[PDB]
């Protein structure tokens, strides 16, 4: 249950997104808070491009690229041809 409580929903949510951003080696908690204030939602976080991440108030294209991969790369690489 997500809506179990909203007071804890925000807490768990920011927690989950923080690790989400930090899924890449380069992105650390510093960037997490950076993207938090920039986008503010997981939707925009995944929808963010290398440029969207780079335009942030202190990130850098390097971390933006790595996140773009995690945010745009398939799980199984190529299960047949969703991509190639």
């Amino acid at each position: 249950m997500a809506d179990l409580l909203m007071e804890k929903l925000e807490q768990d949510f920011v927690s989950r997104v923080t690790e989400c951003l930090t899924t890449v080696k380069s992105v650390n908690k510093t960037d997490s808070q950076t993207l938090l204030t920039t986008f503010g939602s997981l939707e925009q976080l995944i929808a963010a491009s290398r440029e969207d991440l780079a335009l942030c108030p202190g990130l850098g294209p390097q971390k933006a690229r790595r996140l773009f991969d995690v945010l745009h790369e398939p799980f199984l690489k190529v299960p047949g041809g969703l991509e190639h």
Binding site: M1, A2, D3, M6, E7, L9, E10, D12, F13, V14, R16, V17, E19, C20, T23, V24, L36, T37, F39, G40, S41, L42, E43, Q44, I46, A47, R66, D69, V70, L71, H72, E73, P74, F75, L76, K77, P79, L82, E83
Partner: protein
């Protein structure tokens, strides 16, 4: 057998999968099944609440995931129930 249960998980892209593995209503079982059905994390975020419901099987988990993704933590931390 069962959305395929092959030990190929070792070749699955460790970056995007990590983001999925840390999803709210997506648990280890569901995550496996997700990575097998959905192309990537971008897709689960681009799809409808019905789509993930169909894949997860649990309307709740699906809802949690969708609701989480399309909500903004920063806006919840900005307003709502009373913020100062």
């Amino acid at each position: 057998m069962d959305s395929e249960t092959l030990p190929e998980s070792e070749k699955y892209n460790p970056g995007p999968q990590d983001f999925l593995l840390k999803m709210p209503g997506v648990n280890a079982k569901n995550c496996r099944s997700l990575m097998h059905h959905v192309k990537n994390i971008a897709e689960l975020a681009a799809l409808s609440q019905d789509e993930l419901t169909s894949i997860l099987g649990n309307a709740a988990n699906a809802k949690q995931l969708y609701d989480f993704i399309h909500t903004s933590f920063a806006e919840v931390v900005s307003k709502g129930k009373g913020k100062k």
